[PDB]
RNA sequence: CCCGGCGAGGGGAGUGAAAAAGAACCUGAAACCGUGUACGUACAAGCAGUGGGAGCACGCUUAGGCGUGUGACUGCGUACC
RNA sequence: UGUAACGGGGCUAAACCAUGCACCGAAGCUGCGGCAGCGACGCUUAUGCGUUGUUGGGUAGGGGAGCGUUCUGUAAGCCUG
């Protein structure tokens, strides 16, 4: 026969909800880029985005193994020049803690538009409320 | 009531009353087959197997068609070897139907 | 110069887009004689919001 | 209604007229003439004496009705184009093109 | 004696360009490139035809090893279990269980278990 | 007998072709015999 | 006869088997140029395709499908001699 | 020129050592079907086969079998307003 493929339409997503205090950060995000994936369903579609909406609250609480803190760092190019900026993690937290997720999860995601739009699914908090109650968080934990 | 064999070493699921484009055989065009064959058979309640066939599985369909696959293009080519092939190819196929089920 | 390829001719659709003309899609009506006539333009035969002038 | 009209051998480029054939499709007649009168290119002199020519090309040949009128099918397709030669400096010439466009219109009703 | 071809240079051109049909700019016009496009969109499907047995059976295992966890066990251990069980199911056949029966293949995880165990 | 004018377009095709290949042909070196103090520069001879 | 500058060019009428035989006048291909209609396209990076693959619009039919056109998204992949 | 001497994420194990059981993954092997070449078999006996096995990437190149255009006779025949 001709296998089953999953349509847009037929779709049913969901949205989740998960507290990274406490939580080792890459070994976090990959479990976040699975669902998003939708690896973890019976209907995947590698062309289709099956994921389900997740809420990450209290990023700032994240923590990581070692002297990572003080020494794993950032880098991004403004296009000019040649000049190059360089944020540690520390900073980072500091300033812009929702990158920090925002950041892992993209690396380990296809680029291309799928890859931009599960990324569009995900929404993160450094604290520990969110207006988004409407549509539901049915609880989720890891 | 769909359940589950072997053709072509291939296998395939089907229901009763459905059309089934597999290998080709030789048999009389309208005649009939049955297969013990069957890996596993399914229905509102399920019945498997912790080896082939099941016990009594046993499944009958009616051939119908013994016509020839479409056409496909095949090409060998390389690049300033001077070398370049061309082949054709038509794919025999039986078309069947399900006669009914059985346990 | 020397283009190292052709372009299109889809590109230069493209170029000759802004190239498009670009309609007038107003006129007006004598005060008088009602003609057809431009903003601020005399009419052909020359009134100008009612007055004629020229006579020629 | 059919009654269409055309003009051939032209000596103008398809390009440069069909700028002025964007401007009208689908309109009222009358507003045309209104259009082209005031637009200002070589073409639309051109153009225009066409379209006059194929409403009195309806009313004598055919049931006329002017005032309930349209355009509805205009286009331009290039004709021959006459070789002619340009010299230039060091003693080379230059073969030069002046291009023709032949020109249809349809005007209906409908 | 003198031979004149006009004609059955169009055959094999159009020929071609039929085959051209539906690709872009100069690629579906002209013949001193089509023939090179059309040739080489041949050796396309030879090596298409081979990897997508691949595509599919990367696909299956991964509706499956789905599933299984979904049930609370992983790819690999699940099918172990059959093959000393003794269950020559296709991968095939399987995952297309479950996506719209989850019964039986729910039903059946239980099977590798209780062997495996 | 209802003939259009007369078409000369390829008088003036027959006065390319001729003055084309005249200069193009004999005019040989002129381009390069100027190009020849940069044909002398241009080189590197080493 | 009409438009048109007592032009060009054209449309009618008419001849003619046929003006898809009108002087550039048998046939009338391709590059090239345009109008028209269905689909797609303004968060989307690279020999431009193939393999898969929705959705859309059609013609069939049978009544459930079969076909044609497009082609969103995805794996792979750096032309010819 | 710009992270830049893990492919990247990221990893205190998702690193190294030892031990073990699975699994993945090639156009490899096997399974179903098909084509062709070669050899023996006994019938056959320029041939059915039965088979039985085996082979079938390929440049320079060598050998073999072939498609199709014109013209000629077969043709004062055949098709054709």
């Known amino acids: 026969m001709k296998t089953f493929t999953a349509k847009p339409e037929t779709v049913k997503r969901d949205w989740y909800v998960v507290d990274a205090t406490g939580k080792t950060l890459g070994r976090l995000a990959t479990e976040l880029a699975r669902r998003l994936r939708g690896k973890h369903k019976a209907e995947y579609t590698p062309h289709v985005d ?11 609480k994240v923590a990581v193994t070692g002297n990572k803190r003080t020494d794993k760092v950032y880098y991004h190019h403004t296009g000019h020049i040649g000049g190059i900026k360089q944020a540690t993690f520390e900073e980072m937290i500091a300033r ?11 690396g380990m995601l296809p680029k291309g538009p799928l890859g931009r739009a599960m990324f569009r699914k995900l929404k993160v908090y450094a604290g520990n409320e969110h207006n988004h109650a409407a549509q539901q968080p049915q609880v989720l934990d890891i | 009531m ?23 055989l030789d048999i009389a065009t309208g005649e009939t087959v049955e297969f013990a064959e069957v890996l596993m058979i399914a229905n509102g309640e399920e019945v498997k197997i912790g080896v082939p066939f099941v016990d009594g599985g046993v499944i009958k369909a009616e051939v119908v068609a013994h016509g020839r696959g479409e ?33 | 110069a020397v283009q190292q390829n052709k372009p299109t001719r889809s590109k230069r659709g493209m170029r000759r887009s802004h190239d498009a003309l670009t309609a007038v899609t107003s006129l007006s009506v004598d005060k008088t004689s009602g003609e057809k006539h431009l903003r601020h333009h005399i009419t052909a035969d020359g009134y100008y919001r009612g007055r004629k002038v020229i006579a020629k | 209604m059919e009654t269409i009209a055309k003009h051939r051998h032209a000596r103008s480029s398809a390009q440069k007229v069909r700028l002025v054939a ?17 637009t200002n290119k070589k073409a639309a002199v051109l153009v225009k004496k066409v379209l006059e020519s194929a409403i009195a090309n309806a009313e004598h040949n055919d049931g006329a009705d002017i005032d309930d009128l349209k355009v509805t099918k205009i286009f331009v397709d290039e004709g021959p184009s006459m070789k002619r030669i340009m010299p230039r400096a060091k003693g080379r010439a230059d073969r030069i093109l002046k291009r023709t466009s032949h020109i249809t219109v349809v005007v209906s009703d409908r | 004696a003198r031979v004149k071809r006009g004609v059955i240079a169009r055959a094999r051109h159009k020929k071609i360009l039929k085959q051209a049909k539906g690709y872009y700019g100069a690629r579906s016009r002209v013949y001193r490139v089509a023939f090179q496009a059309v040739i080489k969109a041949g050796q396309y499907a030879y090596r298409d035809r081979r990897q997508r047995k691949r595509q599919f059976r990367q696909l299956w295992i991964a509706r499956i090893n789905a599933a299984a966890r979904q049930n609370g066990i992983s790819y690999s251990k699940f099918i172990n279990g059959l093959k000393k069980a003794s269950v020559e199911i296709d991968r095939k056949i399987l995952a297309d269980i479950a996506v719209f029966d989850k019964v039986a293949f729910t039903a059946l995880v239980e099977k590798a278990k209780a062997a495996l165990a | 007998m209802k003939f259009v004018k007369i078409d000369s377009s390829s008088v003036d095709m027959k006065k390319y072709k001729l003055q084309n290949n005249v200069r193009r042909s004999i005019k040989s070196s002129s381009m390069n015999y100027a190009n020849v103090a940069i044909m002398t520069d241009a080189d590197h001879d080493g």
């Open chain 2, 2 to 24: 769909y359940a589950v064999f072997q053709s072509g070493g291939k296998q395939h699921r089907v229901s009763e009353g459905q059309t089934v484009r597999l290998e080709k």
């Open chain 4, 22 to 38: 964007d401007l009208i499709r689908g309109k009222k007649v009358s507003q045309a003439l209104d259009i082209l009168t005031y």
């Open chain 1, 50 to 60: 099956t994921g389900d909406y997740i809420i990450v609250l209290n990023a700032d």
């Open chain 2, 71 to 103: 056409k496909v293009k095949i090409v060998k080519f390389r690049r300033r070897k001077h070398y370049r092939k061309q082949q054709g190819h038509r794919q025999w196929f039986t078309d069947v139907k399900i006669t009914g089920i059985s346990a």
């Open chain 1, 96 to 106: 812009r803690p929702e990158r920090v997720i925002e950041i892992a999860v993209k």
